[PDB]
Amino acid sequence: KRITTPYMTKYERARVLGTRALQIAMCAPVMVELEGETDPLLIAMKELKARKIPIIIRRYLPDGSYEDWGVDELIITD
């Protein structure tokens, strides 16, 4: 039973592409075929385009309820 926004807001995209860029850095396993760039944010932003970031988001409602959205499920805007 999950009734929240189907879309990924800008703050979602900020935290996902920040943690995943630190989950590319700190010698963490990269999960896409790449060309040789050296910035973690470009890797973590080309993984969002390829639906590869495996993060679950706990969108807290004000009660304390949480819905578990996957980054794969959320429609990102172009």
């Binding site: 929240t4 926004t5 189907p6 807001t9 703050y11 969108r59 805007t77």
Partner: protein, 147 residues
């Protein structure tokens, strides 16, 4: 503007060529000599002709943002936005009828792009609107010199 009810709907339309006959009784408890006759015709004279609880609507229908929250249920736009879109769909279907350009789109898809622009423009959760309304009355309040 005016008032609505189950019995107020009944009295003015069915009971004024009927109550207006000659009865000259006293005002019982401040009531009319004919208002007690219409309440006699209301309370114990008909059952299952209480259908004016649906003629007079039981309330207004609620807005489409109170029921059917706007981020999930599509085309749940505000009631002044529907009037703008319907006025524009009345104007567009009269100006695209004679305009000799391509016109690949119709009303059913123009409405859909306007309604999905209304839906996509909702303030996303986390907006911190309190400091956006503490500054929109706090930065132009430094431009207000006394002339």
């Amino acid at each position: 503007l005016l008032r609505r009810g189950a019995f107020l709907s009944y009295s003015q339309k069915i009971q004024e060529a009927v109550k207006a006959l000659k009865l000259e009784s006293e005002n019982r408890n401040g009531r009319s000599p004919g208002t007690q006759e219409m309440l006699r015709m209301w309370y114990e004279l008909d059952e299952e002709s209480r259908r004016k609880y649906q003629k007079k609507a039981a309330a207004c229908p609620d807005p489409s943002l109170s029921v059917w929250r706007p981020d999930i249920y599509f085309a749940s736009v505000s009631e002044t936005f529907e009037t703008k879109v319907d006025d524009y769909s009345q104007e567009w279907a009269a100006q695209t009828e004679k305009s000799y350009e391509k016109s690949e789109l119709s009303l059913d898809r123009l409405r859909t792009l306007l309604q999905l622009k209304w839906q996509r423009s909702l303030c996303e959760p986390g907006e911190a609107v309190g400091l956006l309304a503490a500054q929109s009355i706090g930065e132009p309040s430094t431009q207000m010199t006394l002339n």
